[PDB]
Amino acid sequence: HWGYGKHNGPEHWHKDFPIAKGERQSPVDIDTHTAKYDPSLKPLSVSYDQATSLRILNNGHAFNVEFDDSQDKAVLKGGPLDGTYRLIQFHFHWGSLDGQGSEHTVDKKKYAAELHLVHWNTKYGDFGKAVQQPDGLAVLGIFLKVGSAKPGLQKVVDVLDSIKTKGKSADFTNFDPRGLLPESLDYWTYPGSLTTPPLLECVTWIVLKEPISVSSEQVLKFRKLNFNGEGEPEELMVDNWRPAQPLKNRQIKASFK
Ligand SMILES: O=C(O)Cc1cccc([N+](=O)[O-])c1
Numbered sequence: 001h002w003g004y005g006k007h008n009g010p011e012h013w014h015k016d017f018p019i020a021k022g023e024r025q026s027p028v029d030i031d032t033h034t035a036k037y038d039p040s041l042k043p044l045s046v047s048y049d050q051a052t053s054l055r056i057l058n059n060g061h062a063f064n065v066e067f068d069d070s071q072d073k074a075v076l077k078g079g080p081l082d083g084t085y086r087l088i089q090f091h092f093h094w095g096s097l098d099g100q101g102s103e104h105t106v107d108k109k110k111y112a113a114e115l116h117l118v119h120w121n122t123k124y125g126d127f128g129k130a131v132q133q134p135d136g137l138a139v140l141g142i143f144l145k146v147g148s149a150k151p152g153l154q155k156v157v158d159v160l161d162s163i164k165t166k167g168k169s170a171d172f173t174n175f176d177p178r179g180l181l182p183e184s185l186d187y188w189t190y191p192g193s194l195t196t197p198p199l200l201e202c203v204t205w206i207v208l209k210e211p212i213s214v215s216s217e218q219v220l221k222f223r224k225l226n227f228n229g230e231g232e233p234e235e236l237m238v239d240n241w242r243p244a245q246p247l248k249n250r251q252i253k254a255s256f257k
């Protein structure tokens, strides 16, 4: 019974999942001065025109916006990737305060939140099989800073009161994830892992350099969510970020100079 507390948080996970101390764990600090610009990198193709959102779920550690991944409707290709990656869900990680919440850091800077768009490699046929492979997933990571409102986020924010507690879901159709992307697709990339148990080392991370801006009011609404189930004592869903892990023998590549 893992979580983010003193007694069951990141620092304990290794007892259940020894891979926590592995060679390609995420997140990491992105040292912008040491990331090397890579000309091998093919351009990033995000093709979200046909995306079909289905549902939003409070899974007890975050909320997930789920997509129909039964066809190539919302796909990521190019960049560091070989082949086609289908969108399955997005989620966020966030803090109790505006000064923390992101998982990746940039020259040690923590953002207020981080958006993760999770995609699986179609050559493996389904998500469950893909997470067993070193190239199974591609996660597009976007930092959130507090400032102006993000209009394309509001639809997510307003349904959160209907999924307050663990296990609640709501229909969430017709949501366009393009409205959560910054202007530029410049990125850093490196090989890593999921950042919750089971911590599988199956992710090619693609972290965008340009943050999106959300309002204070928008982030506040994330912090009203609950880790607990209905009828259990209230524990606010905040600080659901794993801290930076050792880079070990990895290189972070930049798509830009
Ligand atoms: O890395 C995370 O935010 C945790 C996580 C946990 C389980 C599945 C996930 N996913 O990528 O569908 C992500």
Ligand code: NI
Residues within 6 Å of the ligand: 001, 002
């Ligand atoms: Ni458990």
Ligand code: NI
Residues within 6 Å of the ligand: 091, 092, 093, 116, 195
């Ligand atoms: Ni994540």
